Curated annotation (Swiss-Prot):
The first C2 domain mediates Ca(2+)-dependent phospholipid binding. The second C2 domain mediates interaction with SV2A and probably with STN2. Coiled coil: none annotated. Ca(2+) 4 binds at residues 41, 47, 101, 103. The modification Phosphoserine is found at residues 80, 82. This is Synaptotagmin-1. Ca(2+) 5 binds at residues 41, 101, 103, 109. Belongs to the synaptotagmin family. Homotetramer. Heterodimer; heterodimerizes with SYT2 in presence of calcium. Interacts with SCAMP5. Interacts with STON2. Forms a complex with SV2B, syntaxin 1 and SNAP25. Interacts with SV2A, SV2B and SV2C. Interacts with RIMS1. Interacts with PRRT2. Interacts with DNAJC5 in a phosphorylation-dependent manner. Interacts (via N-terminus) with RAB3A. Interacts with SYT12. Interacts with calmodulin. Interacts with DNM1 (via C-terminal proline-rich domain (PRD)); this interaction facilitates vesicle fission during clathrin-mediated endocytosis (CME). Residues 10-143 form the C2 domain. Changing residue 41 to G: Fails to relocalize to nerve terminals after stimulation of neurotransmitter release. It is found in: Cytoplasmic vesicle, Secretory vesicle membrane; Cytoplasmic vesicle, Secretory vesicle, Synaptic vesicle membrane; Cytoplasmic vesicle, Secretory vesicle, Chromaffin granule membrane; Cytoplasm.
Amino acid sequence: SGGGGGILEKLGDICFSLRYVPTAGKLTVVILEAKNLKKMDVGGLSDPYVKIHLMQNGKRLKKKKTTIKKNTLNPYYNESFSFEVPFEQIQKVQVVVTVLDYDKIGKNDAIGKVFVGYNSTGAELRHWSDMLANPRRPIAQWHTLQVEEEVDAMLA
Ligand SMILES: [Ca+2]
Ligand SMILES: [Ca+2]
C-alpha cells in the first residue's frame, strides 16, 4: 500500500531490473526501457538517457549513466550496471534512477526520477523487497517517474 506520488505527473515510466547477491555484495541494475516520456525539445521529442546513483544518508556515492537515445519518447536501453554493497548495508542504501533529456548545449534537464531502497514506498518498496527476498534472482518492474523536486526532498 501507499506511495504513488508521481502517478498523475505525466512524466513517463521506466522499467528496470534489480538483482542482489548477498555473499558477493553485488547489486545489479539493468535499465530496460522507458515509455510515455515527457517531451523536452521544442518542435521535437526528447533525447533521453538514464542516470543511476547509489546513495546513503543524502550522499551520492556512485554514479552511472546509459547511452543517449535520439528523438524518442520510448527508448530501449538494455544496459547493465553493477554496484558493490555489503549485505550489512543493503537495507540502508537507495538506488536512484533519473531520466534526462540530453542537450548539446546547456544543463541536461531531468524528465523525472524514482528511487528504490531505504525510505522507498509503494511500488518502489515492493521492487526492492522482491529483490531482497530472492537472492540472485533478477526482478524487472515498471515505475512511474516523479518530479525531481519531490524525489530530491525525500533523498536529502
Ligand atoms: Ca531540451
Ligand atoms: Ca534534447
